[PDB]
Design a binder for this molecule. Structure first.
Ligand SMILES: C=C1[C@H](O)CC(=C/C=C2\CCC[C@]3(C)[C@@H]([C@H](C)CCCO)CC[C@@H]23)C[C@H]1O
Lengths: 10, 238
């Protein structure tokens, strides 16, 4: 549910 | 102080150096501050909060052990600590002279009135400023400061954590490293019950987090103000 937070973590 | 512990400090220092620009040059990119029309400061400070979230993410990714955690955990921990680490990391700009955050010029100097013009009441602001004052008084070594920020992020205690035992074991390596660093490389009197006072700050942050959440729910209740935020801010706090 948090794609922007995910992209920043990847 | 072990070699694994020396290494851990060096990493957090560099991680912090790479995520915290003490000239605050990026601030020119934000929607401008307006200090005259309530909520005039909301667009500038939202942008600042948003930027700050990204820098906390970048910092978090380098915490030794943080990568070993599952994606969902990583999510849960950043989501719930973000505002706290921002409060903690803002201590570097906070100045006791006039109880303000001084980011390099008057345009980027924030005080009580400014935080107020972003929709926040004294129920948050007064203990936020008290928090900054008691943190400033600890006069932490940059090493204790960056360890505190790391321990805040890796808390097994946060709701929705799947692998609470892994988060804990990672937190522990950092605790021990911080407990050991205080004994070694802080001289008294500065090191007196200093760990206990640091861990207490960690509890004050939870309290500040709660307050921020409620004042956030109320602000983002009018879609007119909620549209003044940023997508990252809506996703993280949203
Ligand atoms: C990089 C940073 C920090 O991340 C943030 C900075 C200041 C922090 C401030 C100054 C103004 C008031 C701030 C932003 C508080 C928030 C606006 C309140 C909660 C946000 O929704 C929390 C932290 C407070 C500038 C600079 O020191």
């Amino acid at each position: 549910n948090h794609p922007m937070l995910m992209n920043l973590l990847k | 102080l072990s070699e694994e512990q020396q290494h851990i400090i060096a990493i957090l220092l560099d991680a912090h150096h790479k995520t915290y620009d003490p000239t605050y040059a990026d601030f020119r990119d934000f929607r401008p501050p307006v200090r005259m029309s309530p909520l005039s400061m909301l667009p500038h400070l939202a942008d600042l909060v948003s930027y700050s979230i990204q820098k906390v993410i970048g910092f978090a990714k380098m915490i030794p052990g943080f990568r070993d955690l599952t994606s969902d955990d990583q999510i849960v921990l950043l989501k719930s600590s973000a505002i706290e680490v921002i409060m903690l990391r803002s201590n570097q700009s906070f100045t006791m002279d006039d109880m303000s955050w001084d980011c390099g010029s008057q345009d980027y100097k924030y005080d009580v009135t400014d935080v107020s013009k972003a929709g926040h009441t004294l129920e948050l602001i007064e203990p936020l400023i008290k928090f900054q004052v008691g943190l400033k008084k600890l006069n932490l070594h940059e090493e204790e400061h960056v360890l505190l920020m790391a321990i805040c992020i890796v808390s097994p205690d946060r709701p929705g954590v799947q692998d609470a035992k892994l988060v804990e074991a990672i937190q522990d390596r950092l605790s021990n490293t911080l407990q050991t660093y205080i004994r070694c490389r802080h001289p008294p009197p500065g090191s007196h019950q200093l760990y206990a006072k640091m861990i207490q700050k960690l509890a004050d942050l939870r309290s500040l987090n709660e307050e921020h959440s409620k004042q956030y729910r109320s602000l983002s209740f009018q879609p007119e103000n909620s549209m003044k935020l940023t997508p990252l801010v809506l996703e993280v706090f949203g």
